[PDB]
Amino acid sequence: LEAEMAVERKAVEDQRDGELEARAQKLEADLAELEAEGAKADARRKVRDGGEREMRQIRDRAQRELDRLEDIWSTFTKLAPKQLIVDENLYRELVDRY
Numbered sequence: 001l002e003a004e005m006a007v008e009r010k011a012v013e014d015q016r017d018g019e020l021e022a023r024a025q026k027l028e029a030d031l032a033e034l035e036a037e038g039a040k041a042d043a044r045r046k047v048r049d050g051g052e053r054e055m056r057q058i059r060d061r062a063q064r065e066l067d068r069l070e071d072i073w074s075t076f077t078k079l080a081p082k083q084l085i086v087d088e089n090l091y092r093e094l095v096d097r098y
Contacts, residue, residue: 005073012069016062023058027051072097 034047072093075085085091 005076009069009073013066016065020058020062024055027055068093 031048031051034044039047068090071090075083075090075094076098085094
């Protein structure tokens with residue numbers, strides 16, 4: 001069970017890393033295009049702030065997914081009778097997955 005959950009964690013973290021890499025590559029391409037335009041300093045700062053906020057939001061969503069999976073893992077390992085799951089979404093995830 002530890003081995004199968006470890007490979008599952010590897011797969012989920014690998015798809016998270018792939019999403020991060022793809023988003024970072026797209027953002028870098030957009031930044032390169034903007035730099036090629038050579039816009040004003042104000043425009044450069046505006047677009048840089050927009051891209052940085054987009055990357056922060058992407059990382060926030062990735063961390064949300066990661067901590068959701070970590071909560072799933074902790075609950076599965078720290079599982080015993082008389083345990084309540086208020087959030088039906090978490091219980092649905094557990095039953096659908098394991």
